[PDB]
């Protein structure tokens, strides 16, 4: 199943991006006066609300590499959601042409 390979890998990729992104955000934001994304617990929640595109604004990067990490977290969460949605649609379609009599 190709659609389950792409969705399954993207979700694994997303988890790696969320954890590494939380780590790399703190590493890139510290050293910049005024930054508030400087502790791992709340940086872990920031990566989730970034990947899900919620983006409250309570937490955000101010540096270049912090923003580059943010972009990666944005793209990873969006593409993973696009692949899973696509994989679900083909799963339902193939399931629907079955149950009738089409294999």
């Amino acid at each position: 199943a190709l659609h389950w390979r792409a969705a399954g890998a993207a979700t694994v990729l997303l988890v790696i991006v969320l954890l590494a992104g939380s780590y790399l955000a703190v590493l890139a934001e510290r050293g910049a006066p005024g930054a508030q994304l400087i502790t791992y617990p709340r940086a872990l929640f920031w990566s989730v609300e970034t990947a899900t595109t919620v983006g409250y604004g309570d937490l955000y990067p101010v540096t270049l590499w912090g923003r580059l990490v943010a972009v990666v977290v944005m793209v990873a969460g969006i593409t993973s959601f696009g692949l899973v949605t696509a994989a679900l649609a083909t799963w339902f379609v193939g399931r629907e042409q079955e149950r009738r009599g089409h294999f």
Partner: antibody
Amino acid sequence: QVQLQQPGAELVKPGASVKLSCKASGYTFTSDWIHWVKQRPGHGLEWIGEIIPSYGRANYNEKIQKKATLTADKSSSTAFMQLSSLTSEDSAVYYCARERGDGYFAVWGAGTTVTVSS
Amino acid sequence: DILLTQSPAILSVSPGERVSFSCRASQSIGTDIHWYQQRTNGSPRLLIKYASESISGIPSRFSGSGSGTDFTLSINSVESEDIANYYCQQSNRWPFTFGSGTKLEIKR
């Protein structure tokens, strides 16, 4: 079981340098930050800089003059601070502290009494 | 950066009396304040992390409160071992800063 072990004291000639150490026992996570705090006799706590040994990146206090250079050795779990070009104004007690990346200093060292005199 | 002002410099109190130190920040820092104790010729010791939450090993005598720009460390019934220097530290913004400190003295 002192988590952060520092030498007792260090004597430095005016204008010379010294390499302070901070051997770390206990749990050593990849999210650990080692902070260095300067304290003069009869004075308060002053933040010098931080370093994450798992990555090797260090930040410093911009409001003061850069006298320190932070390094680390993951194989021996020991962070180092290089105080260069010392005067009498650099004579103080230097602590090292371990932060779990959650903001607070959970454990402190005994402090190293650095004296700059001829 | 964020300056932390501690008042008063020296705090006199009678034994068995509830005392309170004050830590105030230049700007709103939520609850990201931490309290430390330093006795004579000793190293700082964490008493309170994140304004109100306690630390294992530290007596229930110590308690903290406040948010925004006004923080308070209280001691129910001060005894002799409480005589030390108390500092507050913020972790809301980079860089971490310390308070000027408050010395506690007991009027026995």
